[PDB]
Structure 1
């Protein structure tokens, strides 16, 4: 019962919901995304710097 749409950018998909409170006269919008992460093997990357 809430108006949506879903739009791609950089090949990531994003919902918007548009609702409102009726007793207060306000209108509200939200934009969401859920990421999932993995680290397979911590020994395969790191940080680097120059050598003095």
Structure 2
């Protein structure tokens, strides 16, 4: 029971929640995201620099 929506940017979805504190009489908003990374094989990438 909290007003919420989602938004999109560059193929990523972000969840936005809008709520309020009554006694203090304030309104607040939050945007949330959760990432996840995997590394399949370390032997398929790295850093390269120019040889002298």
TM-score by length of 1: 0.86
The answer for unaligned runs of 5 or more in structure 1 is none
Give 1:2's aligned residue.
2
Stretches (4+) displaced over 4 A: none
Counterpart CA distance in 2 for 1:51 and 1:10 is 36
Tell me the SS of whatever aligns to 2:29: strand
Instruction: Tell me the TM-score normalised to structure 2 length.
Output: 0.86
Distance 1:21 1:48 in 2: 53
